[PDB]
Design a protein around this ligand. Structure first.
Ligand SMILES: CCC(O)(CC)COc1ccc([Si](C)(C)c2ccc(OC[C@@H](O)CCC(=O)O)c(C(F)(F)F)c2)cc1C(F)(F)F
Lengths: 240, 11
């Protein structure tokens, strides 16, 4: 029972995603080179990758129905707290179970857990990250469910600093109902089974990954040697 | 703490 409004929301989010996700990964040539041979050797390349992703996340969030109507302060707060989570979600499109790596076109842009450690992160984060990616890939989400989950993740009213939490919850409830109705009406069993519950559980997992990444980000960023290798956008969004 | 790059990316 997907209403025209609900299909319209899906159409907007699908178009927003296709405008902001380049599955050819053509722009990876413009990043600083990945060097695999402190020696945070992958930090230049992955900082540019993450910085590039944040740009796409902002472009996607701006096209979420209702998001652009929020105040600038709330839009900023919502993007700052959700960016790391949306990055983890959108990277699942490139995540592969053949090898538990992120396959972005070529061997140069094939990222395993060694690259996340050569970006400065321990396995306090890498282990839950791979488990999240695997459990998310096993959901075999429709592209419609994938973009709705990203959108729902961004417009969460419980983010710190939100002013119009009821307006944010208004948007999210419409995306939530659209996702629920999409699963009932368009996702065939047995994949549909408890799909909404599993997808919302992934938002809880992302909160934990958000917390672990932040504590590791602040410890990495505290050393100016590492902060020098980040980008200005990364420093603005993730913090100084 | 103020975010001019994020804001101009939001127009
Ligand atoms: C710099 C902050 C810092 O902590 C170091 C201070 C490192 O951080 C890192 C570093 C590496 C990784 Si990764 C699991 C190798 C990864 C793989 C693929 C991918 O993208 C594919 C596609 O989705 C892009 C197209 C699009 O996005 O349009 C992305 C993505 F970021 F682009 F999404 C990330 C994640 C993070 C982070 F923790 F930030 F998530």
């Amino acid at each position: 029972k997907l209403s025209e409004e609900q299909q319209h929301i899906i159409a907007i989010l699908l178009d927003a995603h296709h405008k902001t996700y380049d599955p050819t990964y053509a722009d990876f040539r413009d990043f600083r080179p990945p060097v695999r041979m402190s020696p945070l050797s992958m930090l230049p390349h992955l900082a540019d990758l993450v910085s590039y992703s944040i740009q796409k996340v902002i472009g996607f969030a701006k096209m979420i129905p209702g998001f652009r109507d929020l105040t600038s302060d709330d839009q900023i707060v919502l993007l700052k707290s959700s960016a790391i989570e949306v990055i983890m979600l959108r990277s699942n499109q490139s995540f592969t179970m053949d090898d538990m790596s992120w396959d972005c076109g070529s061997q140069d842009y094939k990222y395993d857990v060694t690259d996340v450690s050569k970006a400065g992160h321990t396995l306090e984060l890498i282990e839950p990250l791979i488990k999240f990616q695997v459990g998310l890939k096993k959901l075999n989400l429709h592209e419609e469910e994938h973009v709705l989950l990203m959108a729902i993740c961004i417009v969460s009213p419980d983010r710190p600093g939100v002013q119009d939490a009821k307006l944010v919850e208004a948007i999210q409830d419409r995306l939530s109902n659209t996702l629920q109705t999409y699963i009932r009406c368009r996702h065939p069993p047995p994949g549909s089974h408890q799909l909404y519950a599993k997808m919302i559980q992934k938002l809880a997992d992302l909160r934990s990954l958000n917390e672990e990444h932040s504590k590791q980000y602040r410890s990495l960023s505290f050393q100016p040697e590492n902060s020098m290798k980040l980008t200005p956008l990364v420093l603005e969004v993730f913090g100084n | 703490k103020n975010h001019p790059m994020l804001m101009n990316l939001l127009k």
